[PDB]
Amino acid sequence: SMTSHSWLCDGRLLCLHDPSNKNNWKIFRECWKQGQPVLVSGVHKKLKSELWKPEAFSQEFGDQDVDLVNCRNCAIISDVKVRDFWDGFEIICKRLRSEDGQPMVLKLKDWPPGEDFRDMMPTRFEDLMENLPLPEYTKRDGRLNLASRLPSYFVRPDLGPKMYNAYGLITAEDRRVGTTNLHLDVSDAVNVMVYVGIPIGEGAHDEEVLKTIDEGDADEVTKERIHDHKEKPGALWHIYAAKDAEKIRELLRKVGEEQGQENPPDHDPIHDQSWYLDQTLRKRLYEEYGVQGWAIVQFLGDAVFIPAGAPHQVHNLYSCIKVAEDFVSPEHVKHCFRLT
């Protein structure tokens, strides 16, 4: 039976089932005012699937110049062609190689660049914006988005959306690395998984994805979405409540000291965007500071709602295309105010 919603993270996470249900707002707002993230599944069934394929990005835009990041070590690969990234998205042997002769795990930095998404890709822009869930919150002019309505006393988000493209992390050592390191935004965000690429050549990588989800501390209902329904998993997220940000700063100041970093006692390890919380650091954050997070697996078509001020990190299990829009809900507008 088609149902309106379910719960993940043992009841701590709302999962809405129909992205276009006009009554979503009634369940959504109860959870959102309490500072929780929310998941909406099925957005991929609303989209034109041919507009979101790696092969088509390569053909249409492959000649543009870009920088990439080597996710394993943060090294910047400068001034290459965007086809150099896309033609290795799913075929491993076509990937740029590091000195060691290994195929690199790469992230495409700032593409499309700045606020250029709509100008470069007007048809993708339309397909996405017309199908975002909770549209009164998420559309540029929605009645519950204050982005277009606030004076300069508030930090207003850029015109989006923004596109997040990166390979999947592979090995046992990769389990300790992030696609996007622990950070926080002053605006709310909605992030949609539009494409998951499962590679080939070194295809038969199914078993280390399971250990990563397991060690990622993912709930039993989430492991059931793989083993029973055969959905494509994209990324492992950890999100923490905005109210826990300072305790996370205290932990990362202590661990920095232990690892011989030399930092002024007020410096902000979350704004630095230099940390990924592996299993050891998450266990410590729980035991030593009493802080619990949400572990979330974003499958193809899953929309993840991130509250303003909430520290979060992302780890791609396979190759992903994500598109994200920033917005300013009344529930969380305190987080972008420039005074007190």
Q: Which residues bind Cl ion (CB under 5 A)?
A: 25, 35, 121, 123-124, 134, 136, 180-181, 242
State the minimum distance, in angstroms, from the CB of residue 310 to Cl ion: 8
Distance CA 281, CA 298 (A): 22
First to last CA, the chain: 50
Shorter beta-carbon distance to Cl ion: residue 198 or 242:
242
CA atoms within 13 A on the CB side of 279: 12
CB half-sphere exposure, 70, CA atoms < 13 A: 15
Closest-CA residue to 245 (of 198, 291, 196): 291
Least distance between Cl ion and beta carbon 27 (Å)? 11
In this structure, are residues 106 and 166 in contact, taking their beta carbons and an 8 Å threshold?
yes
Give 316's Cβ-side CA count (13 Å radius): 26
Q: Which two tokens mark 86?
A: 């896309």
Between CA 323 and CA 247 the distance in angstroms is 30
Tokens of 125: 């822009």
> Between 26 and 97, whose beta carbon lies closer to Cl ion?
26
Q: How far is the CB of 220 from Cl ion (least distance, A)?
A: 29
Minimum CB distance to Cl ion smaller for 136 or for 272: 136
CB of residue 136 vs Cl ion: minimum separation in angstroms? Answer: 3
Which of 217/272 has CB closer to Cl ion? 272
Tokens of 72: 């394993």
Distance, in Å, from the CA atom of 110 to the CA atom of 117, rounded to the nearest integer, reads 10
Distance, CA of 312 to CA of 293 (rounded, Å): 9
Closest to Cl ion by CB, 25 vs 289, is 25
Which is nearer to Cl ion, 145 or 181 (by Cβ)? 181
Q: For residue 246, which of 269, 278, 216 has the smallest C-alpha distance?
A: 269
Least Cβ distance, residue 143 to Cl ion (angstroms): 8
Question: Smallest distance, Å, CB 216 to Cl ion?
Answer: 18
In whole angstroms, the minimum distance from the beta carbon of 155 to Cl ion comes to 15
CB closer to Cl ion out of 78 and 123? 123
312 is in an annotated binding site: yes
CB-based contacts of 215, cutoff 8 Å, min separation 6: 175, 279
183 is in an annotated binding site: yes
Torsion of Cα atoms, 22 then 238 then 187 then 111, to 10°? -100
What's the count of helices (H) and strands (E) in the chain, helices before strands?
11, 14
**Residue 185 assigned ligand-binding role:** yes
Instruction: Please enumerate, by residue number, every residue annotated as part of a binding site.
Output: 183, 185, 312
Instruction: Please enumerate, by residue number, every residue annotated as part of a binding site for Fe cation.
Output: 183, 185, 312
